Ligand binder design. Sequence first.
Ligand SMILES: O=C(O)c1ccc2cc(F)ccc2c1
Ligand SMILES: O=C(O)c1ccc2cc(F)ccc2c1
Ligand SMILES: O=C(O)c1ccc2cc(F)ccc2c1
Ligand SMILES: O=C(O)c1ccc2cc(F)ccc2c1
Lengths: 157, 157, 155, 155, 157, 157
Amino acid sequence: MTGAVCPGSFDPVTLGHLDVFERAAAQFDEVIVAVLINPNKAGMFTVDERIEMIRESTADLPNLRVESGQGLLVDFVRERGLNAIVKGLRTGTDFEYELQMAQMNKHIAGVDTFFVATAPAYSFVSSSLAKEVATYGGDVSALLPASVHQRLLGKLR
Amino acid sequence: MTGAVCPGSFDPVTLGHLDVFERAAAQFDEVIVAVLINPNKAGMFTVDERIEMIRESTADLPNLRVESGQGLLVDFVRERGLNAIVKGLRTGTDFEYELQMAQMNKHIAGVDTFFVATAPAYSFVSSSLAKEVATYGGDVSALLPASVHQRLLGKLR
Amino acid sequence: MTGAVCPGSFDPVTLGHLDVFERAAAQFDEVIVAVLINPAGMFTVDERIEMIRESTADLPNLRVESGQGLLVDFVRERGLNAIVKGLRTGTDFEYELQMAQMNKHIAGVDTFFVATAPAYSFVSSSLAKEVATYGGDVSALLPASVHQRLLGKLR
Amino acid sequence: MTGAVCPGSFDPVTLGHLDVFERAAAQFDEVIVAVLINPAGMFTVDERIEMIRESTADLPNLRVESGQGLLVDFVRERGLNAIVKGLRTGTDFEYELQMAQMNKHIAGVDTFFVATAPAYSFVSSSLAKEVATYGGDVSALLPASVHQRLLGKLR
Amino acid sequence: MTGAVCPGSFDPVTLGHLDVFERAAAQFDEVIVAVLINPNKAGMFTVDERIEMIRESTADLPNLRVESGQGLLVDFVRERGLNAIVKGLRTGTDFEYELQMAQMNKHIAGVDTFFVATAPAYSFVSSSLAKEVATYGGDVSALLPASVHQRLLGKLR
Amino acid sequence: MTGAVCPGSFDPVTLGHLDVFERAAAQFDEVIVAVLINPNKAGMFTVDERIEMIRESTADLPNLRVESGQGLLVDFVRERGLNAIVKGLRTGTDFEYELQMAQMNKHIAGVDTFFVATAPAYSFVSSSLAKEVATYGGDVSALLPASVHQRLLGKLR
Ligand SMILES: O=C(O)c1ccc2cc(F)ccc2c1
Ligand SMILES: O=C(O)c1ccc2cc(F)ccc2c1
Ligand SMILES: O=C(O)c1ccc2cc(F)ccc2c1
Ligand SMILES: O=C(O)c1ccc2cc(F)ccc2c1
């Protein structure tokens, strides 16, 4: 009955993201991870690579599935008969641009956004910072799922 | 069966609170509003009065119930077979002390906390500020449930 | 002879901006909306000026002008030394705080900040354009004028 | 006939407050400093008024008055509907933001915020009192008047 | 030659504090932990108890010593021939009251303040929240040194 | 032997930077100012010009030296036998992205980061804003070292 969408670009997915997926899957009957693709800028990983990395590290979550999309998040959510977004947060500044988008999304489509505090251990990892650190040789193995780390190193090499 | 607890003192309940209750009730199978009884801090309304005002305001939410409690919030939550809290936010600053408490609550009892931004309309209302304004004759009727406003005028007479 | 300047790119002007214009117009004798030329956006400077002028017709003490370079030069060349800027968050206070203190330092121009009306608090020109581009209804967030004009740019 | 009110407890008035008074006086025709009666602090209301009056002698369009209850009633009973308040951080913006939006809602009174001068940015009445109490030199942070008066309260 | 003071009320010391002590001791020739006592309000622990709990959990830091004081921090620092304070931080809001005091302290005494980000694992523990959680029975054993936890439980009982 | 690295692009160095350098040099036995060379982002001054401007401004700091570098900052730091970074702050917002980077840097290489609030006088100056103001003829001479200001007028002519 109940359900939420967990959106992001997940390029690549991090252990911070996985933490949020797990907590959403524990509290909602179904969870859809929404991999948002910009048709005008390729990330590091193709859509199929992003989805596979997420599937491989969520195999123990039976009520979670992964789908890509583009355009308005709230269209993705409503077309699936849902009206909740779950998003991970780190700081009060993350709460400002995110609050703006959450209130816009409620205004235009009646979709609710629930924020959850990331786990402390994973709180400083972001996809962008992990990529940037890995590019210049820093060790980010503890911040990313096994499904990701060596594929990341391969892309950089 | 999914479920969440919405905690507060609600002295009195505001439309900001009600907005959070409605969004919780829309997304979880069961919601419990947990009204804090504080042996010391005695506010304007008794616990029974506060429960009654919440029940009037939430009469159209069949999957939401109101109960009072004391002590550790995560004990209240786990005693009812739940492991989620839903709390309303207004600022990035409220994210800071609330983030600390959410991480603590996860650590000591494995209870998740989901934050939701209250509607823009009700974002500057708080129980304490509504009482203060009403005390000096300002009009806060657009910010409180109808029944609450009526009761609040009584306590001031 | 009090007065203030309300700066921005206004591409396009939103109800959030208009709210700030109205409050500045109510508290200062003279208000000048300063439209940045900085080529690059969706609307030309002329179109942006036109849309602001259409939306502020009931504000007799407001006028709209374009400019570039330092805002403080715009302000002082018109005999004024106050800027009025609308806010939303504590984050916006921070980068805006830096510029306000720089502007005070280099030109003695004061900056007054005003909180956005709660209803218009999540709208920005960029977010409104983005949502409208993907078909979301932003008609409640923009002056009637502007909204029809935006639909024109997209179709 | 523009005007604004600058509220506070001013126990005592600091150079940070005076900076804000001067900026408000420069941009509005009429400025009223509103001194909260709320008994409880170090200086009596009369003494606080006196110290502000001493420090603003060169501001012809400023006056000082006491009051209690709702600030918006103070403001509107004097025919005005603007508050000018000085800031320091994004945190202060947040609790002040809540009150500004409430005040707008209940009485239609606008609040304009101004950034503290960098030099006066870490001084507050409470911190100045605390430091002075333990013998720290706060003479650069307070009007000359006030500083001598504070030394008197401590000895 | 070089030295810093690490101040606080440490009532009681937490693992977050210890992390800061260890990092300061690694970067300065000498570190003084300054236990600040309010002569007009007793905390949970007496000054001697606070000092003993800190000494017991800093025994592997040979260049650290612990002293109590009151009044102006900058007097404590300067009377020891030092002019640096090291303080742990958690958030940007912690940076606001702390920035005010750091700039005041530089103004009145020329003392510098260096802030260090707490370790993620210890980021949500504070003395006050640990005491509050422990009072109502929550498990805070992982957030406090061994020198503290059972002494805390004893005070509460 | 204690020591810290003060990183930046310094294009050009400001009095805000200099204030940080002086406080670092006063508290550590050795300070290294690390000037970023970016293969892409070519600013207004060459790396050699930036190093020379910093050296003029820091002529009275005998325990401070200036060097350029590329890639991962923690590699630069550890290659020089150090494990501390000193960075200047202005806001709570700057605490947020910098906090993330400090926790990352500690995690991947065990390098500590110490933050210091710049003097109130120099708290609104930044290299980018100084250049922008100077470009349009505004006077930023009170915000930059004398030599820098002279050089900056040259690049604009
Ligand atoms: O909102 C709160 O802080 C709070 C905390 C603990 C509580 C415990 C209860 F049993 C009931 C309500 C509660 C609210
Ligand atoms: O939006 C701004 O920051 C901005 C900056 C500079 C400006 C200069 C002008 F002449 C006019 C508007 C201006 C707006
Ligand atoms: O400092 C304040 O928030 C404050 C509040 C209410 C006031 C009412 C008055 F009549 C005068 C000053 C006042 C200041
Ligand atoms: O300030 C920075 O972001 C930065 C980062 C990395 C660096 C690496 C170096 F080798 C030298 C300076 C550096 C500055």
